[PDB]
Design a protein around this ligand. Structure first.
Ligand SMILES: *C/C=C/c1ccc2c(c1)C(C)(C)c1cc(N(CC)CC)ccc1-2
Length: 133
């Protein structure tokens, strides 16, 4: 499926710390973030994505149109300017964030009832799994 719609509840989160250190997330935010359960809400209509990630203390919202490059400010993450582009590779949703950090981006894909997220920055890879709620 290429349909990522739904409310997704975190089930596994491997090496979030190394990914966040690659981004120069400060020690403080890192320790809080590594313990929190995240809910990821995706409202997808054609190419148009409205996405949310909510926790009891840290939140991240981004909207994008597949295939349309956009300048992004990674507000309350590492607060950097990147040139973002989200495209399809088969049924994998792939984002490249061009900027100062190397190999920065993410990939989303679904297997069965699970959403998989791979976050990359530098030589670090974080893998998260969500169960559809
Ligand atoms: C499709 C979503 C991809 C994606 C890329 C980067 C991040 C995330 C999802 C989050 C919301 C899981 C997330 C959280 C953080 N935190 C550390 C500052 C917690 C707010 C950083 C980057 C990403």
């Amino acid at each position: 499926t290429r349909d990522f719609n739904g409310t997704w509840e975190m089930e596994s989160n491997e090496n979030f710390e190394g990914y966040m250190k690659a981004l120069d997330i400060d020690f403080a935010t890192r320790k809080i973030a590594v313990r929190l359960t995240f809910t990821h809400v995706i409202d997808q209509d054609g190419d148009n994505f409205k996405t949310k990630a909510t926790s009891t203390f840290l939140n991240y919202d981004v909207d994008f149109t597949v295939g349309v490059e956009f300048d992004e400010y990674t507000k309350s993450l590492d607060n950097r300017h990147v040139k973002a582009l989200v495209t399809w590779e088969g049924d994998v949703l792939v984002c490249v964030q061009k900027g100062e950090k190397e190999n920065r981006g993410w990939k989303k894909w679904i297997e069965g009832d699970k959403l998989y997220l791979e976050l990359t920055c530098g030589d670090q890879v974080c893998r998260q799994v969500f169960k559809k709620k």
